[PDB]
């Protein structure tokens with residue numbers, strides 16, 4: 001039995017996705033076929049309702065000099081983060097000498113807008129290659145993990161932060177209590193800790209199990225974040241649902257009683273209770289649906305091959321590691337994966353070892369079918385790939401059901 005990382009309660013497993021590789025490691029084709037693996041399974045705390053993985057991957061195996069994800073690769077996301085930055089500039093950063101800290105700034109997708117406004121800021125980016133990309137834009141970055149001690153160090157030299165922000169980053173820190181202690185040492189008394197991550201309600205509704213992989217330790221809900229904040233002296237004071245990344249919620253935490261929660265918080269809590277979101281039975285039914293999507297997806301991919309149809313994948317997502325390894329999908333069923341990230345191209349995907357090629361290579365003559373791993377980017381991608389569909393090529397999606405369009 002494993003102990004909850006928020007509260008120490010007991011975690012009950014409901015989904016076992018078996019042995020899995022590191023999702024963001026892309027090997028050269030000549031590399032030894034050895035990879036770190038771990039058991040990926042998900043459970044729910046008995047006491048605080050936090051849904052979480054049962055085995056942690058050590059941080060330094062995932063996040064380091066060669067981490068390959070570049071935030072600024074999506075036009076939708078560049079606009080999404082510039083707007084959030086302007087919203088903070090108009091609201092929480094209007095003081096004399098305001099200060100914003102971002103946890104997980106990556107290539108500077110959000111902080112560039114802050115820097116261009118002349119506002120004091122600091123990004124934490126322990127993956128040094130993407131940290132350098134942010135520093136080239138004139139952003140101030142420290143190549144360290146955010147945790148209690150590094151937060152203390154920033155408080156000592158820079159003073160309190162008006163906003164601490166994290167997007168797609170808090171989800172992967174199992175040492176969330178250390179981060180909370182850091183936020184407590186660093187945040188201004190009237191500041192906010194704002195984070196946005198994949199939402200449990202969307203995952204259950206869409207059967208989007210590919211959101212579950214080594215860099216998604218927590219599947220947060222308003223119910224579990226409310227408990228986590230409270231147990232640490234914060235309070236959930238606003239929630240906003242976001243369409244990005246398959247469905248997210250942005251959570252705003254303030255010191256307890258310092259601000260009054262928006263009506264939005266109670267509304268979302270009540271909908272999660274009515275829908276029995278976090279009940280073990282609902283979560284087990286989700287797990288049953290995961291197996292049905294596996295079985296349908298592999299039946300389709302095998303019938304396509306029996307029918308002489310060509311199949312590739314589009315987007316070398318981290319998420320796709322779960323799909324290929326749980327369903328047993330490799331290059332005999334999906335020949336190549338197309339992707340815009342230079343450091344993933346001319347490499348093999350983890351576990352399944354499908355070759356990754358540049359997206360500029362997806363061109364006439366097109367394959368019959370493209371398995372859309374980057375399904376969270378469907379509008380942006382399909383807008384760029386109208387010629388493929390006009391030519392008769394079709395997309396295979398597995399969210400929220402296996403279907404072709």
Ligand SMILES: Cc1cn([C@H]2C[C@H](O)[C@@H](COP(=O)(O)OP(=O)(O)O[C@@H]3C[C@](C)(N)C(=O)[C@@H](C)O3)O2)c(=O)[nH]c1=O
Pocket residue numbers: 069073074075168172215216245314315316317318319320338339340341344359374376377380381384
């Ligand atoms: C828009 C676009 C993307 N692409 C390619 C680029 C990417 O490799 C991938 C998309 O990856 P995308 O769904 O954004 O994240 P991933 O699941 O990897 O997940 C990563 C890792 C991480 C931090 N743990 C996380 O949660 C999210 C934020 O990021 O697809 C195109 O080829 N053409 C395009 O037009």
Ligand SMILES: Nc1ncnc2c1ncn2[C@@H]1O[C@H](CSCC[C@H](N)C(=O)O)[C@@H](O)[C@H]1O
Pocket residue numbers: 063064067069071103104105106109124125126127130144145146147166167168169173
């Ligand atoms: N403890 C921690 N502190 C700060 N950054 C962290 C961290 N653990 C991991 N990271 C960083 O978290 C980032 C997640 S990538 C996504 C980042 C970006 N905010 C976006 O939303 O697109 C990686 O760049 C990784 O190095």
Ligand SMILES: [Zn+2]
Pocket residue numbers: 004005006007008009045046047048049050
């Ligand atoms: Zn718990």
